[PDB]
């Protein structure tokens, strides 16, 4: 009869010890627009120099640890889409025909 539900998460019942914790470092992070952010990592924890902060952007670490700059590639350009079907000499002949077209526009 009664329809029941469960939000898919675990609920335990323990003591909130504010005294007996795992000790922990705090890493300061600096974003692109100079925003400071102090992420609490654990003690036994590798600190990534990059971190998506609370700002909604990427915030690098406040030290000069030199993370990897790009490790990426450009997606594609309209010129790449153009070059997949046409020749460089084809586009250069079109460039010369539009040069003559602007010549007829200008002084012809």
């Amino acid at each position: 009869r009664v329809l029941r539900g469960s939000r898919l998460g675990a609920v335990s019942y323990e003591t909130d010890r504010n005294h007996d914790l795992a000790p922990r470092q705090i890493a300061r992070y600096r974003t692109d627009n100079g925003e400071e952010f102090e992420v609490p990592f654990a003690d036994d924890a590798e600190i990534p120099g990059t971190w998506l902060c609370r700002n909604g952007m990427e915030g690098t670490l406040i030290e000069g640890d030199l993370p990897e700059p790009k490790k990426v590639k450009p997606p594609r350009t309209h010129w790449d889409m153009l070059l997949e079907r046409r020749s460089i000499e084809e586009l250069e002949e079109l460039l010369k025909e539009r040069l003559e077209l602007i010549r007829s526009r200008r002084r012809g």
Binding site: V2, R4, G5
Partner: protein, 98 residues
């Protein structure tokens, strides 16, 4: 078909109220005019119990149960859950509710 009581049974999902209805254990709807009458008696404390620690104070309810079965004094009612729901909605409507 009608006799229907509840000490502590199931609760609602979105709100934290005790889920009424005889299909459940089911509370009683402590409506508006009952709030009026218990205002008119001037009984502030019983109204505070009925609107916080029998209804929506989530951490208050287990402390009430613990104080009863330990036989200790009933603790102070905390903030009701529905008021915090109202506060979060009003903060979510871009209104700084200081």
């Amino acid at each position: 078909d009608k006799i229907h009581a509840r000490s502590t049974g199931p609760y609602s999902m979105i709100t934290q109220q005790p889920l009424g209805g005889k299909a459940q254990f089911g509370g009683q709807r402590f409506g508006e005019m009952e709030c009026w009458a218990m205002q008119a008696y001037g009984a502030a404390y019983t109204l505070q119990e009925l609107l916080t620690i029998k209804s929506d104070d989530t951490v208050g309810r287990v402390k009430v149960y613990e104080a009863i079965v330990k036989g200790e004094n009933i603790p102070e009612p905390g903030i009701p859950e529905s008021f915090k729901v109202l506060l979060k909605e009003l903060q979510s409507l871009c209104l700084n509710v200081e």
